[PDB]
Amino acid sequence: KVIVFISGSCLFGAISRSLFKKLPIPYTVVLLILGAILGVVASNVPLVEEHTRDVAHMDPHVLLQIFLPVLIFESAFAMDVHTFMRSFSQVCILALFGLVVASVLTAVLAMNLFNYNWNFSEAMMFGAIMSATDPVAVVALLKDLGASKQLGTIIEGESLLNDGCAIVIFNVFMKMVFFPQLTSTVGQNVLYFLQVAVAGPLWGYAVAKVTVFFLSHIFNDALVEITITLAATYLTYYIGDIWLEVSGVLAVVVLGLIVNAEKTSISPEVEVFLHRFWEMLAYLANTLIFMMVGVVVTQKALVAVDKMDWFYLIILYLAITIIRGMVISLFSPILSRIGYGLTWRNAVIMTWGGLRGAVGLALALVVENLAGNDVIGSKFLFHTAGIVVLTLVINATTIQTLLRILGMSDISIPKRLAMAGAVRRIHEGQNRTLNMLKSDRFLADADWDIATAACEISDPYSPREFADMMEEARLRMLKAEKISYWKQFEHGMLAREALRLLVQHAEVAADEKDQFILVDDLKKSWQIKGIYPWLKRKLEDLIMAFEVTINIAIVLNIVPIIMEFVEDALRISNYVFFVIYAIEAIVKILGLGRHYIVSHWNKFDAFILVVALRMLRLTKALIPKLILVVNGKINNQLSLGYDVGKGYIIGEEEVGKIIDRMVDNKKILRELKHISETGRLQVVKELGLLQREHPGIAVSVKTRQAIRTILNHSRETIHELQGAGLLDEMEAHKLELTVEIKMKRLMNAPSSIPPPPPENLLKNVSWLAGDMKLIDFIKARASLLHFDYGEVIVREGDESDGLFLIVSGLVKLYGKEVFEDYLTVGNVIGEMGVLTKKPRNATVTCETTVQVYFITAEDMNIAIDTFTLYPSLEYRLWRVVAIRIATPLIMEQMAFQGWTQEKVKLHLERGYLVDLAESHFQFNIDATLEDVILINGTAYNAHTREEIRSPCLISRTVHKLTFQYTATEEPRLFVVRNAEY
Amino acid sequence: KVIVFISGSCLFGAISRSLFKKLPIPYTVVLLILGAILGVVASNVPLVEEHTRDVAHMDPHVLLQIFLPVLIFESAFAMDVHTFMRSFSQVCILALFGLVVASVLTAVLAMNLFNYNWNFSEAMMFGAIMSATDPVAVVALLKDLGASKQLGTIIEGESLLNDGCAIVIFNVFMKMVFFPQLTSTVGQNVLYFLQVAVAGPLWGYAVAKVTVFFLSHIFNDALVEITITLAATYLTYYIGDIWLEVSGVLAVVVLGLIVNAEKTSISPEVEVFLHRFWEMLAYLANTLIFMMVGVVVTQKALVAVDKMDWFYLIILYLAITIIRGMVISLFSPILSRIGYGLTWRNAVIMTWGGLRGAVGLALALVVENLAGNDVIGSKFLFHTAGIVVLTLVINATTIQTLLRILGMSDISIPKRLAMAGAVRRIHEGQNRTLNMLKSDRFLADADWDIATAACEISDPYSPREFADMMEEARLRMLKAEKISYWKQFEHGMLAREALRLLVQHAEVAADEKDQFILVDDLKKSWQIKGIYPWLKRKLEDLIHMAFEVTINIAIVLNIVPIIMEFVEDALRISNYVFFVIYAIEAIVKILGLGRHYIVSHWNKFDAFILVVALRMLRLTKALIPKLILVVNGKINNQLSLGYDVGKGYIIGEEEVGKIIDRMVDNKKILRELKHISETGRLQVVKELGLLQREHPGIAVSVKTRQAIRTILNHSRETIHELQGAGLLDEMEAHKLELTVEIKMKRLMNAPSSIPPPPPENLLKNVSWLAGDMKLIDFIKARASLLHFDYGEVIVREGDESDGLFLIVSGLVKLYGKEVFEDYLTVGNVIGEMGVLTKKPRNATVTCETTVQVYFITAEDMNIAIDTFTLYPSLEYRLWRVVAIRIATPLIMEQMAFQGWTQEKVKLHLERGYLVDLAESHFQFNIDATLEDVILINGTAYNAHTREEIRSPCLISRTVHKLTFQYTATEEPRLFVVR
Ligand SMILES: Nc1ncnc2c1ncn2[C@@H]1O[C@@H]2COP(=O)(O)O[C@H]2[C@H]1O
Numbered sequence A: 001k002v003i004v005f006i007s008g009s010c011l012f013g014a015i016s017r018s019l020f021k022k023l024p025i026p027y028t029v030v031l032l033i034l035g036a037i038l039g040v041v042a043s044n045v046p047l048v049e050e051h052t053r054d055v056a057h058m059d060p061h062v063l064l065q066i067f068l069p070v071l072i073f074e075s076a077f078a079m080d081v082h083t084f085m086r087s088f089s090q091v092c093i094l095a096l097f098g099l100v101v102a103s104v105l106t107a108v109l110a111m112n113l114f115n116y117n118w119n120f121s122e123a124m125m126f127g128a129i130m131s132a133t134d135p136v137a138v139v140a141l142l143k144d145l146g147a148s149k150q151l152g153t154i155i156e157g158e159s160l161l162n163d164g165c166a167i168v169i170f171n172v173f174m175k176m177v178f179f180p181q182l183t184s185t186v187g188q189n190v191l192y193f194l195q196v197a198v199a200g201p202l203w204g205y206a207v208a209k210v211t212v213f214f215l216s217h218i219f220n221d222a223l224v225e226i227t228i229t230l231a232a233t234y235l236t237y238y239i240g241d242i243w244l245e246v247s248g249v250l251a252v253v254v255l256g257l258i259v260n261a262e263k264t265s266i267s268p269e270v271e272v273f274l275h276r277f278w279e280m281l282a283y284l285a286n287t288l289i290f291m292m293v294g295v296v297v298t299q300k301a302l303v304a305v306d307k308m309d310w311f312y313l314i315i316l317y318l319a320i321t322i323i324r325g326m327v328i329s330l331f332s333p334i335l336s337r338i339g340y341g342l343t344w345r346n347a348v349i350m351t352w353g354g355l356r357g358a359v360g361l362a363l364a365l366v367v368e369n370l371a372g373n374d375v376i377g378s379k380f381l382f383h384t385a386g387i388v389v390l391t392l393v394i395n396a397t398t399i400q401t402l403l404r405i406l407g408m409s410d411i412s413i414p415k416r417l418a419m420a421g422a423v424r425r426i427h428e429g430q431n432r433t434l435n436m437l438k439s440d441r442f443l444a445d446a447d448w449d450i451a452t453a454a455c456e457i458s459d460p461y462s463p464r465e466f467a468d469m470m471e472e473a474r475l476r477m478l479k480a481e482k483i484s485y486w487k488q489f490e491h492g493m494l495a496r497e498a499l500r501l502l503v504q505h506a507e508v509a510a511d512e513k514d515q516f517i518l519v520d521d522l523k524k525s526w527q528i529k530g531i532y533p534w535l536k537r538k539l540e541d542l543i544m545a546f547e548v549t550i551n552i553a554i555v556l557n558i559v560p561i562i563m564e565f566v567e568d569a570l571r572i573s574n575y576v577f578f579v580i581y582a583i584e585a586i587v588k589i590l591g592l593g594r595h596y597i598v599s600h601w602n603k604f605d606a607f608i609l610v611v612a613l614r615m616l617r618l619t620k621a622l623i624p625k626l627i628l629v630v631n632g633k634i635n636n637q638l639s640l641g642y643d644v645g646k647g648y649i650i651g652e653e654e655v656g657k658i659i660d661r662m663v664d665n666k667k668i669l670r671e672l673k674h675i676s677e678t679g680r681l682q683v684v685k686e687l688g689l690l691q692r693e694h695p696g697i698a699v700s701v702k703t704r705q706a707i708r709t710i711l712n713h714s715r716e717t718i719h720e721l722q723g724a725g726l727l728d729e730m731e732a733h734k735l736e737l738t739v740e741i742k743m744k745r746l747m748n749a750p751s752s753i754p755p756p757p758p759e760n761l762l763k764n765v766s767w768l769a770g771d772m773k774l775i776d777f778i779k780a781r782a783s784l785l786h787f788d789y790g791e792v793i794v795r796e797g798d799e800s801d802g803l804f805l806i807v808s809g810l811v812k813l814y815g816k817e818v819f820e821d822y823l824t825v826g827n828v829i830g831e832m833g834v835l836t837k838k839p840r841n842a843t844v845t846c847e848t849t850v851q852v853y854f855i856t857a858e859d860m861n862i863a864i865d866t867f868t869l870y871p872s873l874e875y876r877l878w879r880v881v882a883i884r885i886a887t888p889l890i891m892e893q894m895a896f897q898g899w900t901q902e903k904v905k906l907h908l909e910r911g912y913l914v915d916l917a918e919s920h921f922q923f924n925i926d927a928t929l930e931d932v933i934l935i936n937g938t939a940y941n942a943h944t945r946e947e948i949r950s951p952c953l954i955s956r957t958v959h960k961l962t963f964q965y966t967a968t969e970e971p972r973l974f975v976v977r978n979a980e981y
Numbered sequence B: 001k002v003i004v005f006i007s008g009s010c011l012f013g014a015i016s017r018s019l020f021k022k023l024p025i026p027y028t029v030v031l032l033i034l035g036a037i038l039g040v041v042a043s044n045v046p047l048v049e050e051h052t053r054d055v056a057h058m059d060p061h062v063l064l065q066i067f068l069p070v071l072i073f074e075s076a077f078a079m080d081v082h083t084f085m086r087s088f089s090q091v092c093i094l095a096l097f098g099l100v101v102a103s104v105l106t107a108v109l110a111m112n113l114f115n116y117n118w119n120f121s122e123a124m125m126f127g128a129i130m131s132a133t134d135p136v137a138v139v140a141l142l143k144d145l146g147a148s149k150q151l152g153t154i155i156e157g158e159s160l161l162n163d164g165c166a167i168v169i170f171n172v173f174m175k176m177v178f179f180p181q182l183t184s185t186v187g188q189n190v191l192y193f194l195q196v197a198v199a200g201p202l203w204g205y206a207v208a209k210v211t212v213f214f215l216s217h218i219f220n221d222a223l224v225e226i227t228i229t230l231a232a233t234y235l236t237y238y239i240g241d242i243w244l245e246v247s248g249v250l251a252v253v254v255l256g257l258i259v260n261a262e263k264t265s266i267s268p269e270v271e272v273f274l275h276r277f278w279e280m281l282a283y284l285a286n287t288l289i290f291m292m293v294g295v296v297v298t299q300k301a302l303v304a305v306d307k308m309d310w311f312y313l314i315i316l317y318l319a320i321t322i323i324r325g326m327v328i329s330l331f332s333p334i335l336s337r338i339g340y341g342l343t344w345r346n347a348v349i350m351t352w353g354g355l356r357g358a359v360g361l362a363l364a365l366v367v368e369n370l371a372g373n374d375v376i377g378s379k380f381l382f383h384t385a386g387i388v389v390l391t392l393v394i395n396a397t398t399i400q401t402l403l404r405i406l407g408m409s410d411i412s413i414p415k416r417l418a419m420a421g422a423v424r425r426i427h428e429g430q431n432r433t434l435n436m437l438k439s440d441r442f443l444a445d446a447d448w449d450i451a452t453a454a455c456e457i458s459d460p461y462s463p464r465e466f467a468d469m470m471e472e473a474r475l476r477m478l479k480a481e482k483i484s485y486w487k488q489f490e491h492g493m494l495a496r497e498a499l500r501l502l503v504q505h506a507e508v509a510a511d512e513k514d515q516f517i518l519v520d521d522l523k524k525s526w527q528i529k530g531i532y533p534w535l536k537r538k539l540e541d542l543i544h545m546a547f548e549v550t551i552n553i554a555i556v557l558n559i560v561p562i563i564m565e566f567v568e569d570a571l572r573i574s575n576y577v578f579f580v581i582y583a584i585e586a587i588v589k590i591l592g593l594g595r596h597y598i599v600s601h602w603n604k605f606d607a608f609i610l611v612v613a614l615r616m617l618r619l620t621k622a623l624i625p626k627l628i629l630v631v632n633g634k635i636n637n638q639l640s641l642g643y644d645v646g647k648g649y650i651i652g653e654e655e656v657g658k659i660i661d662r663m664v665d666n667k668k669i670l671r672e673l674k675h676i677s678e679t680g681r682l683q684v685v686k687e688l689g690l691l692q693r694e695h696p697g698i699a700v701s702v703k704t705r706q707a708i709r710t711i712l713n714h715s716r717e718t719i720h721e722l723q724g725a726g727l728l729d730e731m732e733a734h735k736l737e738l739t740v741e742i743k744m745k746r747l748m749n750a751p752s753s754i755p756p757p758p759p760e761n762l763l764k765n766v767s768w769l770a771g772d773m774k775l776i777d778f779i780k781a782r783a784s785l786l787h788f789d790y791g792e793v794i795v796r797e798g799d800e801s802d803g804l805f806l807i808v809s810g811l812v813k814l815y816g817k818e819v820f821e822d823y824l825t826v827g828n829v830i831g832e833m834g835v836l837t838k839k840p841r842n843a844t845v846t847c848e849t850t851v852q853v854y855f856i857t858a859e860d861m862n863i864a865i866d867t868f869t870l871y872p873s874l875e876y877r878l879w880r881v882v883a884i885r886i887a888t889p890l891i892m893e894q895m896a897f898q899g900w901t902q903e904k905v906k907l908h909l910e911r912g913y914l915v916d917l918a919e920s921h922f923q924f925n926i927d928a929t930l931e932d933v934i935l936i937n938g939t940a941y942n943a944h945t946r947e948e949i950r951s952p953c954l955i956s957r958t959v960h961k962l963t964f965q966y967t968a969t970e971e972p973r974l975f976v977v978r
């Protein structure tokens, strides 16, 4: 019956796809040709005639209900959603206007020239059936050799919208023509138009949001989400099919776009499985419909032969080609003026990009089968088969020729240079490892000709002098900046979108002109000036159990509206609404203790309750949702702008220190350094102004990039640990799943701005001995002094003024060999100036804006006199300065070799100070104390009578020590007991 | 009509699967419970009654033709094929015997005790319907917490074979019971049995091989192979369904097993897509059939209430449980004796491993629907629903309790120690990178509490003294050997199977007893003593070519009308065509009769068949080379694997022997451990050497197949490092890495057939640059092929010069004098300066392995020198070789040639010549045209500074003119490179 035909069709499609892969002509036309052969065999042998008659004469219902929604759903599934949304406005405008112009022009051309006794509706149906297209072949060719990304997305989106509008027009006009028993008045026609406009896509959006919310609560389960997605898609299609014969495909398209847009709630395995499954179904449908078209056209059009239609076909193709070119040629200056400009290469490649696919053949089969025994169906089928089999080869050959000639698919010089360098590096490394392997003991009598020929690799590709030198120098500088950007991305310091924005900004201004870097485009990239801030300014300035119950009651009030739009239950529903109003009155009575005297907005709700249509109650809960989503929407773009600004700054800083060695001409080097430093200084001030506008964006981006850097380095560490054999494959995978989970949780990070860190709470918590004395010191010291870049607070050798503790920022200390230290938030500086009364010994500078608290010598004396009986703050300060002095001289010792900063920090935390007054300035060293450090003073050995002074390390050989008490130098020691105690 | 029921069924299955994931009870019983609820709603409301009446009363044809083949196909698709084949024999024996014993015991128990007026066929049907089971739940539980691999495969294979034989028996009896109008004589019954035996699986094998051969010619295309595989599976099922009512499932199972077995011709993406698609279909079918069973049993069994059946159910469950235990308990000693032994833990976990699934419920629905208005269908459905809903909870709880109690799912000490060490290392690295990141300029006012809490990680888990010390020392040594094996695998020096074999050999002898390493098990691992060599020995010793291939194809075509013979004018024309083919064969034989007219032993039978005029003998002689080549490949793979694992053990022991000494400090333990390790190494090296001696191609194959792996791994690491430095972007890196993946894929199907040994004369002529007739004369005057084994020194430093030696097989190590160590491979020339400079010796060369060398004496060297005198091109080439050998090491170490590798300085100095001192009268002028000037030999006097220098030395660029003094004992020699 039908089995052998389908199996043979699949085998023929497979062999045709495998054979004609190399030729630029798409495979599908071969299928059509093969179908033609079957026709001239179906007229003689009764067996193939029986098989074809059983299969090729199916009902239109199955075609119109199955073959088209699958194809349009596939055309609306494989597209990149974000790239589509980047140009949705121009794509929609161009697609709609091209569709309407092409349809009306084809209709009037047919009526004027064909000399057929047709009506206007037949010609409009002809135009609609000649308007639809399919871009899978041209986008496949572009993927193969076009070397472009945005062009295919533009073509796919335009084709999708064109197909949707074309099938809408064809369905309405076919229903008007072939069923001449329906009223065509305006009152229901406008209702039908608005229904198809608004009711369908909103229903698809609602079901998509519902199923996404359902899938959000599913963890590490793969079958459930696949089955739920398939069932939801079929349910949407079935409700659309019950509703109309048109809006179902629109609802399916919207649902597919929304599902493809979301990525956080669906694991990638499900997405790739769904892509593969839907692609397989679409390919099968396309092959079957092509073979059916071929066999039916060969069996039918042999009795409709004339020279007039053969003359008509060529001029029809010429007319549709010229109008398709002319509409976009006329609309190009408007697009250039509005800002969505496109190059003339894009226009000339768009002119030939219209390839007819399978939608037109489907509609032709439907309109031929519904025509009965009439010549109109044969004319339709023959003309559409002729035009598709003409364009499918001619347009493909011409687009390949134009893509070759225009040279946009040309490998640039840096691409070839980088590929050659990479190939040379790989070959050198392989030669080195071969040389190492040849020296191995067990690698003897291995034929090295086979080994060398097996692993060989190769690339797939194979004042004028001053101006040329400047041009090549700036090209090399652009190359260095690009590789710096890629290095920064690979180390993890950047996000994804900022990286591609920087790369494309560098590329579009690389070889266009002499200027290479611009700042105002970056300015508009990070700042927001569109309609969103104006909408926010208008919106936010012009305007739980009880709320949930009120919302549920308002939703329940739609059921009387449903009945009204369509009894005892309805009266009971009105009584329930009155009871809900009474419950609202009871809620007001309960809130009378808070506020019930008068209200402004609630008068409308009171009037609505007096009427009892309760949709006005839900807008109070709807108000926070709009601000909640728009604040995140603007903050995401603001964070991306700050990120790309920081990336440009750090890239310029990295490339600044290498340009001097690259060139040797003085004038070029000077002018390049001048323009680079002016650009950096111009952008850094605006970045600082953006930071000063609000501080939460910087905090968010720093705390969202530190996690990325830490996770990347942990992944590198675990890969290295796997490479050393200390753990096997399964444990490594089990541990790496945790890293993947951490990254997945980081993906949906709270991009909403975290509150700024507290001032008093962090002051009390960060210091160990937080008490009421700290509060008294804060009340006696409120400076919050701010120092910007390029300022030095104190200098070495200057007289001591007091103690300074930092509350915001990072500072760098240079002291004396020499050392460099970095103090973060919560550090205390100026310590020995109040204890040992030393003027100064080191210089501290600030690399950014810092907020600090100032304590003077008088303030320090007042603080010291504030607590005297139990100076816990003073004792903690003594411990802090003691461990600060003792820390750097222990890790460098040979005894503590192989110890990190945290190891020596946590080793010495369990140590105290020695009371020299109780011990009468005499100490005995035993094995109980693990470490003894001379903090201050001069110590005299009780055995060797040797005098030593701080900074020094007491050896384990010394057992008894004596100290001399002096007012100007009081001896101090730190003792850490053994870890076994 | 049917849509809402299916949609609600899928939603209920989804919510039940999501909710009951944590509890050890499988989700499916909840579905059954939910179905029960629908029943007590279907009896009152006419709407749900209409929906249930429409969907749940489905005809048996769709169930019996759709629901069962999908389930059995899924049970025969997700299995690991190789692990199944490792124990196929014991799995088949145990499954078949357990099935037949359980079926007959259930039948006789039902007939004796149930007091129902049933026949023997009804009880056999009852046993067949109670024998089937499903492995999905138990294997899922074992994947979750069983911590085992082989047990799940054993259970799955047993369940698959049991299901296939059970459905065969059920069909062959149900076709007799409910259709009492068919003859049951032996003559057709034995034909049916042999038909199911041989016709089905062979047809599945043929279609699988045909579609694999079809898919082998498809490159980088994904849709075509998926569509072809699906169409081939349906075509196999349809031909099986037309053929018999039960052969289709067997053919589909065989086709699925063969498709899953193959891996080279199918890309992994297609395989995982097919796995996911088939699993989705099976899950949907299982959920739907469970809900159907629940609703039908609640609607039906409410009018079949008694205490007799409610008492019979418990004793039936007890009887089937005890017989299932007892059959394998009785068969365990036979398995232990035969060598396929299993531990008592495996037996006690296999006893409770029988969980009834969906096949029995499918057969119950079929038999209940075909029973009509009779009590037998209700009894069948109620009893099977009761037993499945009892076992599905009770057996799951008991198997979880037993798995906890028996302690086989316990984390060992080394696992916890390694996990803790890895966690500590990761935390230390993260702390270090956080400390580095805190000092960055642009990382200011970032709340570090959130950063620390976000990236925190943790593990999922949380003379007696002398003997204890020895035990912990040998455990630590085993851990060191295991990590050495993993390091060797990760560096790329091992294959996959040898790695897992060595790891499991280390594991099974780790904590069992005091001994740790055995050698005779490795001996039987690398050597072959099975039935394969004996069958090869008896087989291969007991037994215009294109036109012959065309004649064989025609003889194959002659078999096509034989189907008509088994089944007119066309048949007579077929006989005439066969006679014409016979005449053509006779003409071909007469043409070949000039070379050989007498018929051979097989040719006499061929002539007899031609007189008969069959092609079976021609096909057999065509497939004789096929069986020869597949036997050769099968034996060579095992030999290569054994040699690989032997080499891996040797290099692992060599690595661990250097580090074992530092680990322990007790003298006696260290001495005895070194003694046993060295005795094992010395025992295994001699056997490996003789194994390599017996046939040398295996070693050549394994070396040339592992060098490519090492080179490709290091190239991949280099490309990853280059990507990490930003010199190329993502797309170019992926495009380049595709080439590495293609190289690895081509290496996967490597020519494991043994390459021929390298030639002797051809390599001697080609490897040397100046190969000519003089080399042939030297070979005729020097044929030594001396073989030196390990531990032998050929010459020593200071001994008198004897001649020149050129190495033809092996690698040697030279120690000379600072001091230097050199490695000479095949094709090197040694002992060259001893005849040129008349020097005795200056360095000592030894051999690290067996070496085959050619010996040339001083008299032979003099004869060779006197052989070519007019144009001694061999002598000129030797002078160039010794000149470049002397000049090479002293240039790369110079500051001028800094950053130059060995190949760079080798290819830089190849465009160099010698200076003729006779033509220049021993005076040379150095200009900028010559890039490098090297004093090879002699004393050079500067013409300006009057300074005397001698080789080895480097002439600086400041020196312009030089003079040389000619001496017989020291002739000056120089080399100049442009
Ligand atoms: N080794 C050190 N590490 C960190 N900070 C130091 C070190 N030595 C001195 N300082 C700080 O530098 C300050 C310089 O002036 P003061 O002596 O007032 O107090 C000193 C300490 O706060």
Ligand SMILES: Nc1ncnc2c1ncn2[C@@H]1O[C@@H]2COP(=O)(O)O[C@H]2[C@H]1O
Binding pocket: B801, B814, B816, B822, B829, B830, B831, B832, B833, B834, B835, B839, B840, B841, B842, B843, B885, B886, B889
């Ligand atoms: N630098 C070197 N590198 C490699 N081989 C050498 C080197 N120097 C000497 N030889 C070889 O060692 C041999 C020792 O004895 P002969 O002098 O007969 O010939 C010598 C050369 O073949």
